[PDB]
Amino acid sequence: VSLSTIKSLIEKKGANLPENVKSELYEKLKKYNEKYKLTKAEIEAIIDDVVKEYERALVEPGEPVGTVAAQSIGEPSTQMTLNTFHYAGVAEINVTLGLPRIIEIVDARKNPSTPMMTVYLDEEHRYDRAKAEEVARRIEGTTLENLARSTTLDLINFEFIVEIDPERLERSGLTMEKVVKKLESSFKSAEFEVDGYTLIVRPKKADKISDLRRFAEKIKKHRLKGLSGVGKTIVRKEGDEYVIYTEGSNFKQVLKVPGVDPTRTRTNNIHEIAEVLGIEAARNAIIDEIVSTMQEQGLEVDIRHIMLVADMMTLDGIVRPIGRHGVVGEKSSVLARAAFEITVQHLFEAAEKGEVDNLNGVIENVLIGQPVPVGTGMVKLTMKLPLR
């Protein structure tokens, strides 16, 4: 049976199936036909069985998907660990894990506790450690403290000699003259009598200890090369290419750095994704974040519940917390909102606006004493009276 015949039969019979289903069916049918020499009768029976199974697997109307999704998300979290760990890896960046991470994503906090960016590389720089280190230097956000082997903060005679390590200088790609030139081009009102492998500073003839301490700490953590708000970078090698993990969050700036593959680049902060790439990207990032957080703990949760949660969150263009600050607090049902508040001004506002309560929820119907419009509360029955 020529593969065109299998494709034609698939299109003829299983037209109802989703695209992925029919594609996978075609692939595996081709494999099994080339391995076992199937005839057309078996193919027709197989496609009919697939169609019947898919028809059986469809969800029925009236199913309360929202409550099921909420329960299937909440329940595993009780078995999931509760932070209170300090995973100290070597080639890794500390990231909030487990229940705190899930809570941060769900409540859509503006800034995550441990922002972290994943940066991929273009073809030129992907297959070499040295080019990866070069791109890292472009993105390292190197600081004088990291460059320095050690620091000596001697306030007793108003000076500050910081010892700079040659290996860190070579790794960053910066030379002593270069860094001193950048520092003086930035710190114009300062005198840098650099000697050997030590920096020497003076605060334009300061007087009090605190002033020179503040000036020294100002220089110590001052940025030299790199995008704003970026800390340590750990260039690893996953699969076959080198990938640059990075702390901080400068997702829009990093996309312009040469050698950076912007298509695959991602970041932890969902709000930044919403600002830069749009709202669909924010939804996909939320889904991926929740999936990864569930996976690292070993728990398994169906993708559909997470998809429903993500779709509900980003319903009006802007990502909002799912809690009472952005979703529950704007419930249309004035009766449902009523048993969540402390004031009565909401009733007056609703009466003024002429708001109509559709009684489409659960709390309002429960309070009234009427069947909830879910499941068996949805159907209507009729009968022909003449009976045997």
Partner: protein, 76 residues
């Protein structure tokens, strides 16, 4: 040179014409106010010529079904 549509996290966007817009609206027995909304400041909107009151068709890449169509309206 880099367009947002090349990113893996961004599905393809398209602008619906009047006939398909009204056919879609009639298919689900809904009005324009009952659809999900996308702000006019969204980068995907700027990349297109979208204007407020228009319906954007989004072709998601679904892990479960592969292809899936989502629709949003543009507001201020």
């Amino acid at each position: 040179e880099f367009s947002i549509f090349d990113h893996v996290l961004v599905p393809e966007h398209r602008v619906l014409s009047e006939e398909e817009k009204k056919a879609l609206l009639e298919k689900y027995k809904i009005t324009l106010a009952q659809l999900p909304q996308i702000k006019a400041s969204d980068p995907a909107v700027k990349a297109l010529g979208a204007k407020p009151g228009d319906v954007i068709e989004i072709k998601r890449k679904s892990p479960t079904a592969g292809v899936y169509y989502y629709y949003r309206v543009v507001v201020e």
